[PDB]
Design a protein around this ligand. Sequence first.
Ligand code: CA
Ligand code: CL
Length: 269
Amino acid sequence: GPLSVAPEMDIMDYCKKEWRGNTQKATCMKMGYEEVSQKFTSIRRVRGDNYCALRATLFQAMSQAVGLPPWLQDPELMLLPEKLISKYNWIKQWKLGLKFDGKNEDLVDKIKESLTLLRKKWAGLAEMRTAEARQIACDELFTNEAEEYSLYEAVKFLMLNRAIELYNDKEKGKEVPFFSVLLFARDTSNDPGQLLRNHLNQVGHTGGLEQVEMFLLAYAVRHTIQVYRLSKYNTEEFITVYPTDPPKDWPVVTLIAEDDRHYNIPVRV
Ligand SMILES: [Ca+2]
Ligand SMILES: [Cl-]
């Protein structure tokens, strides 16, 4: 299919096209792009569907991949679908986001296939000897075909796993990050099953990640997500980093968000 992350263009040309006229919002948005443009020259427009936040984050993480992170090296990752679904039968209420090949007879098989794909593609990008080869390959992967959407199934599953872990830690009285307190405080998300039924199952289908779920995404893929929040320009939230205090060895991916549903990718040479 066509690219789901558009070819790059100059960021101020993008701004000039998008934000015309004299409203206060238009002026704020221009100031916001001017801020971004101090560090990045170009922008790639990420498809604005209900996967937008996942697409933006994953595209940029994968396009920057020069290694395979430990969490993807871990043999346990491939074992997780069986362990979790066997333990927590309610995970079978999972809403699939593509049609899987018929070799895949159950949910465990489907999720395992998606995690295997994520691992294989990431490993292959990390092995590439030129940055150019890696962007060619990454581009090809985000072409609106089943492979692309299977990556999001993997990432959503990792988000669910991390949320289960954080919930169970809180239940054992262990220290957890505060974002997880806020995640579970939502009246539609009081436990992991509610998170799945009312939030994760909607992601890619009827809505995108909420603010609090960007923390969960960052934790799930162990990337620090640095977001220029252009709707927050004249406040301290003009950038928000998810999470605030990550391990120093998590890679950083930078995004731009005019609002919470739409993330684009700033780029530079
Ligand atoms: Ca190129
Ligand atoms: Cl024009």
